Design a protein around this ligand. Structure first.
Ligand SMILES: [Mg+2]
Ligand SMILES: [Mg+2]
Ligand SMILES: [Mg+2]
Ligand SMILES: [Mg+2]
Ligand SMILES: [Mg+2]
Ligand SMILES: [Mg+2]
Ligand SMILES: [Mg+2]
Ligand SMILES: [Mg+2]
Ligand SMILES: [Mg+2]
Ligand SMILES: [Mg+2]
Ligand SMILES: [Mg+2]
Ligand SMILES: [Mg+2]
Ligand SMILES: [Mg+2]
Ligand SMILES: [Mg+2]
Ligand SMILES: [Mg+2]
Ligand SMILES: [Mg+2]
Ligand SMILES: [Mg+2]
Ligand SMILES: [Mg+2]
Ligand SMILES: [Mg+2]
Ligand SMILES: [Mg+2]
Ligand SMILES: [Mg+2]
Ligand SMILES: [Mg+2]
Ligand SMILES: [Mg+2]
Ligand SMILES: [Mg+2]
Ligand SMILES: [Mg+2]
Ligand SMILES: [Mg+2]
Ligand SMILES: [Mg+2]
Ligand SMILES: [Mg+2]
Ligand SMILES: [Mg+2]
Ligand SMILES: [Mg+2]
Ligand SMILES: [Mg+2]
Ligand SMILES: [Mg+2]
Ligand SMILES: [Mg+2]
Ligand SMILES: [Mg+2]
Ligand SMILES: [Mg+2]
Ligand SMILES: [Mg+2]
Ligand SMILES: [Mg+2]
Ligand SMILES: [Mg+2]
Ligand SMILES: [Mg+2]
Ligand SMILES: [Mg+2]
Ligand SMILES: [Mg+2]
Ligand SMILES: [Mg+2]
Ligand SMILES: [Mg+2]
Ligand SMILES: [Mg+2]
Ligand SMILES: [Mg+2]
Ligand SMILES: [Mg+2]
Ligand SMILES: [Mg+2]
Ligand SMILES: [Mg+2]
Ligand SMILES: [Mg+2]
Ligand SMILES: [Mg+2]
Ligand SMILES: [Mg+2]
Ligand SMILES: [Mg+2]
Ligand SMILES: [Mg+2]
Ligand SMILES: [Mg+2]
Ligand SMILES: [Mg+2]
Ligand SMILES: [Mg+2]
Ligand SMILES: [Mg+2]
Ligand SMILES: [Mg+2]
Ligand SMILES: [Mg+2]
Ligand SMILES: [Mg+2]
Ligand SMILES: [Mg+2]
Ligand SMILES: [Mg+2]
Ligand SMILES: [Mg+2]
Ligand SMILES: [Mg+2]
Ligand SMILES: [Mg+2]
Ligand SMILES: [Mg+2]
Ligand SMILES: [Mg+2]
Ligand SMILES: [Mg+2]
Ligand SMILES: [Mg+2]
Ligand SMILES: [Mg+2]
Ligand SMILES: [Mg+2]
Ligand SMILES: [Mg+2]
Ligand SMILES: [Mg+2]
Ligand SMILES: [Mg+2]
Ligand SMILES: [Mg+2]
Ligand SMILES: [Mg+2]
Ligand SMILES: [Mg+2]
Ligand SMILES: [Mg+2]
Ligand SMILES: [Mg+2]
Ligand SMILES: [Mg+2]
Ligand SMILES: [Mg+2]
Ligand SMILES: [Mg+2]
Ligand SMILES: [Mg+2]
Ligand SMILES: [Mg+2]
Ligand SMILES: [Mg+2]
Ligand SMILES: [Mg+2]
Ligand SMILES: [Mg+2]
Ligand SMILES: [Mg+2]
Ligand SMILES: [Mg+2]
Ligand SMILES: [Mg+2]
Ligand SMILES: [Mg+2]
Ligand SMILES: [Mg+2]
Ligand SMILES: [Mg+2]
Ligand SMILES: [Mg+2]
Ligand SMILES: [Mg+2]
Ligand SMILES: [Mg+2]
Ligand SMILES: [Mg+2]
Ligand SMILES: [Mg+2]
Ligand SMILES: [Mg+2]
Ligand SMILES: [Mg+2]
Ligand SMILES: [Mg+2]
Ligand SMILES: [Mg+2]
Ligand SMILES: [Mg+2]
Ligand SMILES: [Mg+2]
Ligand SMILES: [Mg+2]
Ligand SMILES: [Mg+2]
Ligand SMILES: [Mg+2]
Ligand SMILES: [Mg+2]
Ligand SMILES: [Mg+2]
Ligand SMILES: [Mg+2]
Ligand SMILES: [Mg+2]
Ligand SMILES: [Mg+2]
Ligand SMILES: [Mg+2]
Ligand SMILES: [Mg+2]
Ligand SMILES: [Mg+2]
Ligand SMILES: [Mg+2]
Ligand SMILES: [Mg+2]
Ligand SMILES: [Mg+2]
Ligand SMILES: [Mg+2]
Ligand SMILES: [Mg+2]
Ligand SMILES: [Mg+2]
Ligand SMILES: [Mg+2]
Ligand SMILES: [Mg+2]
Ligand SMILES: [Mg+2]
Ligand SMILES: [Mg+2]
Ligand SMILES: [Mg+2]
Ligand SMILES: [Mg+2]
Ligand SMILES: [Mg+2]
Ligand SMILES: [Mg+2]
Ligand SMILES: [Mg+2]
Ligand SMILES: [Mg+2]
Ligand SMILES: [Mg+2]
Ligand SMILES: [Mg+2]
Ligand SMILES: [Mg+2]
Ligand SMILES: [Mg+2]
Ligand SMILES: [Mg+2]
Ligand SMILES: [Mg+2]
Ligand SMILES: [Mg+2]
Ligand SMILES: [Mg+2]
Ligand SMILES: [Mg+2]
Ligand SMILES: [Mg+2]
Ligand SMILES: [Mg+2]
Ligand SMILES: [Mg+2]
Length: 74
RNA sequence: AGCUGGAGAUACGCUUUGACUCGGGGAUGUCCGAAUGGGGAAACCCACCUCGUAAGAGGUAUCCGCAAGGAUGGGAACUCAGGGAACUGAAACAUCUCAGUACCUGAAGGAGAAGAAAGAGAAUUCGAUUCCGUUAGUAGCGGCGAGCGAACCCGGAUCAGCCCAAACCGAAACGCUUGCGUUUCGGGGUUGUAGGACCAUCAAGCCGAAGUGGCUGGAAAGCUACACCUCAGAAGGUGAGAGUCCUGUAGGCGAACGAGCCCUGAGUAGGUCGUUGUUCGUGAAACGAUGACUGAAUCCGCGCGGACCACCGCGCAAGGCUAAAUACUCCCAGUGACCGAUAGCGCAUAGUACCGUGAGGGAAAGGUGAAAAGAACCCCGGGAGGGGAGUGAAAGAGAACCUGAAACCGUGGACUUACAAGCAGUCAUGGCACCUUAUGCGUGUUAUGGCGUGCCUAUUGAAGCAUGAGCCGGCGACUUAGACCUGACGUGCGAGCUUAAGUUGAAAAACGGAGGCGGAGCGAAAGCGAGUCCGAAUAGGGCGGCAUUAGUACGUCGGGCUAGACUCGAAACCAGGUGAGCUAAGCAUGACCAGGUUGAAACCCCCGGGGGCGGAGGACCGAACCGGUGCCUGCUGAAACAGUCUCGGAUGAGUUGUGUUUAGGAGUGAAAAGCUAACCGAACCUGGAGAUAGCUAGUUCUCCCCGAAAUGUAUUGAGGUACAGCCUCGGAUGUU
RNA sequence: CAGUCCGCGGAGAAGCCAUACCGGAAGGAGUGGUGGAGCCGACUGAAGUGCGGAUGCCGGCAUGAGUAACGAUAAAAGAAGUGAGAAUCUUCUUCGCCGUAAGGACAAGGGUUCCUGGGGAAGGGUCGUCCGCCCAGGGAAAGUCGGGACCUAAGGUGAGGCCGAACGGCGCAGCCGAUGGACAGCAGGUCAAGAUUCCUGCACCGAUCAUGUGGAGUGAUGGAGGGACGCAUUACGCUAUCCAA
RNA sequence: AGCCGAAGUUGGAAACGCGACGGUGCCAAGAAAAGCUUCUAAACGUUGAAACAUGAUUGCCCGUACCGCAAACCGACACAGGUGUCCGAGUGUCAAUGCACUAAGGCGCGCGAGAGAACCCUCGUUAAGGAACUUUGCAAUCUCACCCCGUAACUUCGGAAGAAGGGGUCCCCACGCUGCGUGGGGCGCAGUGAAUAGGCCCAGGCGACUGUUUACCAAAAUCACAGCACUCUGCCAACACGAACAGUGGACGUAUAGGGUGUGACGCCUGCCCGGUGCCGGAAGGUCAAGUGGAGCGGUGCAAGCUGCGAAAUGAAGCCCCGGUGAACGGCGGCCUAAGGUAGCGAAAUUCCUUGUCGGGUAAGUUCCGACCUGCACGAAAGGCGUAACGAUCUGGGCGCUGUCUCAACGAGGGACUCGGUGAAAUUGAAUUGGCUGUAAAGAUGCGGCCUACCCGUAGCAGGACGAAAAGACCCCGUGGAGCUUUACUAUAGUCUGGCAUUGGGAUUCGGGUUUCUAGAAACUUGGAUUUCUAACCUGAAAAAUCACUUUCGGGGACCGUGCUUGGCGGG
RNA sequence: AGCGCAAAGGUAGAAGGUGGCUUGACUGCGAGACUGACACGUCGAGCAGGGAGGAAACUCGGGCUUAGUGAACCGGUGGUAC
């Protein structure tokens, strides 16, 4: 489970292979030939709180952690 | 005052110092199971620690926390959430739909969710959330196709908003060059018409009014002659139909214990890239929502008003809690133009029997009689079965016990039949029999004469040698839904007509105008308006006048739509499971292969050759065993793949046990698409699911009237559809 | 089926059964016969409302028909018994059939099928007095055999630990897990039915304690050895066991 | 044994069992763990040890009946099927678990009795002939064990080989040797006297071979095989299973190894053609995404400003382009294409015309064999030509013998038939069910005429009932389905690539930024680029196997791995 | 004979041939009919604004006629100001 500690998340979306796009450029107005679902996540770090451990930590959570401890220390 | 479970059976007994039975608590409560001392193939194995006499009792899992003390699992449907189908429609099919449906998984409760505006919205209104009606199929989305589809206003059901961070005091512990600031505790402080600081009853139950004589009968509750009670004539039982026999009902009481109302939230608002929700499919695409990278502002401040800007309005996000109206119905009561033994739940009980290795599938159901009085006794028979006798109203009820239809099997009697050719009959005549709707224009039968291609379906055409069908019974197919559209008929009111949600009553229905339809049309729309669009003015289209054709709320019915949509019927597709106990291989570990034949190296002598010696081999022959080569038999089998005989191997790439691992687009395969539990070019089960079916078959009571078509054009069309053509019903017209 | 009337009914309802009667048809009456407890007629309302068909469904009964067969061509025959009844059950004497089996012992796996006494519906491809069927009652004995209170292979688990939308997927030690390692008795007897279990004879094992010798060193979840392993052939002795006189 | 209890000898045979964990040879190199024996650590003591002897005491749980190659298990059954392990006597026969008889033990298979038709199944003998039968000698003969003698073309020298072919086989006696051999006699038709117990030869095709396969219509020429070849892969290897920086397999292997592909022992060999396609190199130039850039074109405001578009240049892989590669996909012909067939073979498993022509073999040869070549439409590792040996392989021939046949006959048994007991099935519109000829949907019992036919059975046959069975698997149709294919379309796991994050100091060349100063350079970078560094990270060694600690530590290294996004490749 | 291409009709007072002028190869309309199931299609007098030729009557909203063509959706370009 990729739960990135404080603001844990794992997302999925559907994604669209759009054809020869013009849109407001011209008549070719994206035929949409692809409808398939995707996923994504994030990587790993190590931290301390109460007594030190190590946990997956969002890089955005690392950016918050370089500004000061938040509930748990770096 | 009986009790001693169903259970119907005997014996043993308990009870008026209160049994039983009913309500309420207590106390015991073996083992499995979240199972939790440890193991494990549930319900069984093996321990340790304190009590310590012993029999016996208590503790010994993990997660959160010092510590109390929580948690694990289960629950029919309902809720929220993390994932997320495919048939299907689109008459093909990708976007689309089917659908956030089915399904899986998580959390939880009697509900849940959501909820106290950085909102809807366009009146400078509204003031939490949920739910119904409506707005409304309006807006809108859509290969702008099939189709998908809001919200506000308004009307109801229910309506409660409450709490913390933060500026500031008191620290206290700790942090630094010296009356100061990181997270902890009390005070205080909770906002937008900006707020705030600091300075001026129901449970178990009891009581409960009132009828007797005669008659029929086996029996009284029926009939009948006189009565009585009624705050009670709801109902059920009693030998049949009971206000007055019972139990009850109306009414009334009813308990020790019993349940139940200077600050105002940043790694964030915002942005780019990928995406998505509401009607939102990149569309001009705002807004929320998050994966990645970034990254503001403070009250002369921030977000929104659907690209974007100014103005003008709505509102203060990045902290939390919050009943009720709402959903379901495992369970209880009540009720029914609901069923009544093929119906109704699968079950008048049973998730049993039975089928399956499994997941899982899955039945038939019934009836003495009032009461057992359930047939003493005798007869034939081992019986079984039966005949008497009795019981009983009935034994024309006797336990294969209500009725007891049809197929189908028999016994007896009338008429008939052994040179006849035959869809089983139809009319006629004669012969015989009989006379209970019945001496006749008779009933049963019959001889001869004439006549005469089963039924349905599908068809140009059916006796067909075209389909279906053994026969009788019984189940078995044009339905339901909706504030839908359209027509016919009927009714109320009528230039007006009517409610929906709900509210109050219910042995009964009234209120409820939000809202819908008529009243004006033309236009692409702004917009004009009996006129209007086209246009530079005149020519037209739709429209009113005129015939002002009257509408609307219901009911019934004909059609239409949407949804299984007249019933049955696919081969398939998808989801989550169940299966390697068959078979396909692997692994671990054990075991098995009579006997006989041949005689490799190597080693040792005589000159690569001879001798010895030795005992090798995917060597030879042949039993077990493993395997199936050819004929035959078997072919409703002895057997859902065999048997006799014959044949392949038979120390190797061998056979075989146990245990075990590998599976569904997946496994395994010395490779046939072979095997994966007896139908494998994608198992099985449950489900989606009544998939779709332009294809087939089937669609039952009667009579009256009318009466077709197989043509034309169009079509991923030709065996199918659309529009004409032809039929019919009604209205008008009025001889066309 | 429902509402409302009219009524009927143990001197007998519906239902069932005949029937020459009646309406234009779907149909409906009269009378008789079962039946034995509810029901007709009229008006209205609602429907799961009218069957010959669907290789339709549940059910019963036909035809084929007293036909094919009676499940290995290892044959059976006489006496005698029992008995309601015997080609078949019991016994006797011949006969024939298997004999690396068609004998015996185990494992599975089945679960009372075992033994005794009884029974005769149905199951037994005929019969049946019999049975592996029905009824009732007995039989099943372990310190040493197999397993467990020991061990480990594959495999499965698995505190910690590594991962992963969820459920979960892995995963060191340890643990489970026999098909393997380890380990103490044999000979005999016998219920109707048990046997290295019970009884008889005489052994072994471990454990506790006592008496004594000895009269002091024991000596771990750690080290070490060992347990510890293939195939084909093959020499020597021997037993089981069988042959001869 | 026996009528309570006798005897228990001599000779021989002999296990897979015991001694044993024996010897020897081989290569494919053959569990773990506790019990057990021996050591100390800690601890307990060293005048109530370890051990031994005797006595006593203790000995828990579960299983054990019966069936158990089958009437009691798996096959819906009292089922001809299967079912793992152990023991399984004797006579004879070289041997044996074989064959025949039989001990022990066990059983006659749960309808019987007649009869001796057709027909059918398993069988015995058969005149004369002998394959004439037929697709084919399919089937059934024939051959048959042991011993002696004798055996070809060919050969990889091992084999073909049991080649072929001939001879013996029994009983008695004497003699020799360790039951054999030597002589003699004897009996029959006959001497492995009964049972088990190879037919053989010549010549092809295909495959070398043993082997493997479509449970249940195909066992082969299919598949695999050693051998060969290409090609990849430097070790967290390529490669595969996988939500996964998890973990595994490859592999406790490391280029003499591992993966894939195709040929398929051995022998002689394996030619031509890089044009397309693939791939491997190159990478002057063409084109190519996001991103960097934002010159300009517009809105909207009085304006500050906000905001919609938006070029040029610069942007990777990749494709176009240029070489090459064939034991890569392939091509090697039609009165210009990249070339046009090197050897070898050829009427083929490939030959249409086709029974090609000639020869061979038979009286007669569409077959077959050998030559020829006019190869419709051979050919070199989708291998070409051979090959000994091998084959339940296919084809042609010949010997041998046969009821396959001319041509069937007689006999046996199990049915079939008759009687008694039990007693089904597929089917079935209903049947009072004829012949001809005509007619009708065009194949008449059923319509027309004409003929024939008393009622009913029973044993038989197989023409009719378009008989029976499975709503034709062939064909067509359905805007049905599914499996498979590819340069059909679309996506997409996977995979390559640029940029952003994890992700950092620094030197070193900097197209450039600012305040810095006599066109200029120190403080300094925003970056890019090589190069280098060790705190991020990855990885490995040490009593602490996976993991965490520390590491005198060791290596890589801001890459690799992972997150987002870009563009390509992508029948898996 | 000819009539731009295929043929049928038609045509000698021209539709054939040859010059002058110019664009009616117009905008807005459409009475009436033909034809088609629809949907499309054909012919069309005359009115407006304004042109062109002719001295005028008059003739011009394409070619002697019949073929020279594709609804609908989605978009490009110019106007317009809903
Ligand atoms: Mg989602
Ligand atoms: Mg009772
Ligand atoms: Mg437990
Ligand atoms: Mg447990
Ligand atoms: Mg469709
Ligand atoms: Mg589809
Ligand atoms: Mg659901
Ligand atoms: Mg759920
Ligand atoms: Mg829960
Ligand atoms: Mg009276
Ligand atoms: Mg009553
Ligand atoms: Mg976006
Ligand atoms: Mg679109
Ligand atoms: Mg029922
Ligand atoms: Mg019934
Ligand atoms: Mg049920
Ligand atoms: Mg049962
Ligand atoms: Mg009886
Ligand atoms: Mg009676
Ligand atoms: Mg009766
Ligand atoms: Mg009875
Ligand atoms: Mg009754
Ligand atoms: Mg009855
Ligand atoms: Mg006569
Ligand atoms: Mg006749
Ligand atoms: Mg007819
Ligand atoms: Mg026809
Ligand atoms: Mg027919
Ligand atoms: Mg039929
Ligand atoms: Mg509604
Ligand atoms: Mg009306
Ligand atoms: Mg008008
Ligand atoms: Mg109506
Ligand atoms: Mg109608
Ligand atoms: Mg309609
Ligand atoms: Mg269906
Ligand atoms: Mg061999
Ligand atoms: Mg040989
Ligand atoms: Mg096989
Ligand atoms: Mg052979
Ligand atoms: Mg499936
Ligand atoms: Mg696949
Ligand atoms: Mg199968
Ligand atoms: Mg569906
Ligand atoms: Mg048609
Ligand atoms: Mg029509
Ligand atoms: Mg007219
Ligand atoms: Mg009566
Ligand atoms: Mg009647
Ligand atoms: Mg009665
Ligand atoms: Mg009734
Ligand atoms: Mg019905
Ligand atoms: Mg019909
Ligand atoms: Mg029927
Ligand atoms: Mg039936
Ligand atoms: Mg017969
Ligand atoms: Mg018979
Ligand atoms: Mg038989
Ligand atoms: Mg006898
Ligand atoms: Mg006698
Ligand atoms: Mg007697
Ligand atoms: Mg009897
Ligand atoms: Mg006697
Ligand atoms: Mg046996
Ligand atoms: Mg057992
Ligand atoms: Mg017995
Ligand atoms: Mg007995
Ligand atoms: Mg009996
Ligand atoms: Mg019987
Ligand atoms: Mg017997
Ligand atoms: Mg025991
Ligand atoms: Mg003992
Ligand atoms: Mg043991
Ligand atoms: Mg695991
Ligand atoms: Mg084990
Ligand atoms: Mg064992
Ligand atoms: Mg032992
Ligand atoms: Mg005794
Ligand atoms: Mg015994
Ligand atoms: Mg051996
Ligand atoms: Mg003697
Ligand atoms: Mg053995
Ligand atoms: Mg251990
Ligand atoms: Mg026993
Ligand atoms: Mg037992
Ligand atoms: Mg069977
Ligand atoms: Mg059997
Ligand atoms: Mg033996
Ligand atoms: Mg023997
Ligand atoms: Mg012998
Ligand atoms: Mg034998
Ligand atoms: Mg036996
Ligand atoms: Mg017998
Ligand atoms: Mg025979
Ligand atoms: Mg002969
Ligand atoms: Mg001869
Ligand atoms: Mg012939
Ligand atoms: Mg032949
Ligand atoms: Mg053949
Ligand atoms: Mg043969
Ligand atoms: Mg030679
Ligand atoms: Mg030789
Ligand atoms: Mg020979
Ligand atoms: Mg002689
Ligand atoms: Mg002789
Ligand atoms: Mg002999
Ligand atoms: Mg013989
Ligand atoms: Mg071969
Ligand atoms: Mg062989
Ligand atoms: Mg086969
Ligand atoms: Mg075969
Ligand atoms: Mg790793
Ligand atoms: Mg090959
Ligand atoms: Mg030839
Ligand atoms: Mg040939
Ligand atoms: Mg060849
Ligand atoms: Mg010739
Ligand atoms: Mg030839
Ligand atoms: Mg080649
Ligand atoms: Mg080859
Ligand atoms: Mg050979
Ligand atoms: Mg072979
Ligand atoms: Mg031959
Ligand atoms: Mg004969
Ligand atoms: Mg005979
Ligand atoms: Mg008989
Ligand atoms: Mg009988
Ligand atoms: Mg004719
Ligand atoms: Mg005809
Ligand atoms: Mg006739
Ligand atoms: Mg007739
Ligand atoms: Mg026959
Ligand atoms: Mg069909
Ligand atoms: Mg078909
Ligand atoms: Mg298709
Ligand atoms: Mg990808
Ligand atoms: Mg892309
Ligand atoms: Mg495909
Ligand atoms: Mg002219
Ligand atoms: Mg005009
Ligand atoms: Mg004019
Ligand atoms: Mg003029
Ligand atoms: Mg424009």
């Amino acid at each position: 489970y990729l739960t990135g500690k404080k603001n844990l998340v794992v997302n999925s979306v559907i994604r669209r292979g759009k054809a020869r796009a013009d849109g407001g450029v011209g008549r070719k107005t994206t035929g949409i030939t692809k409808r398939v679902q995707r996923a994504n996540l994030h990587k790993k770090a190590i931290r301390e709180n109460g007594q030190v451990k190590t946990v997956w930590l969002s890089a955005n959570a690392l950016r918050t952690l370089s500004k000061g401890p938040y509930k748990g220390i770096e």
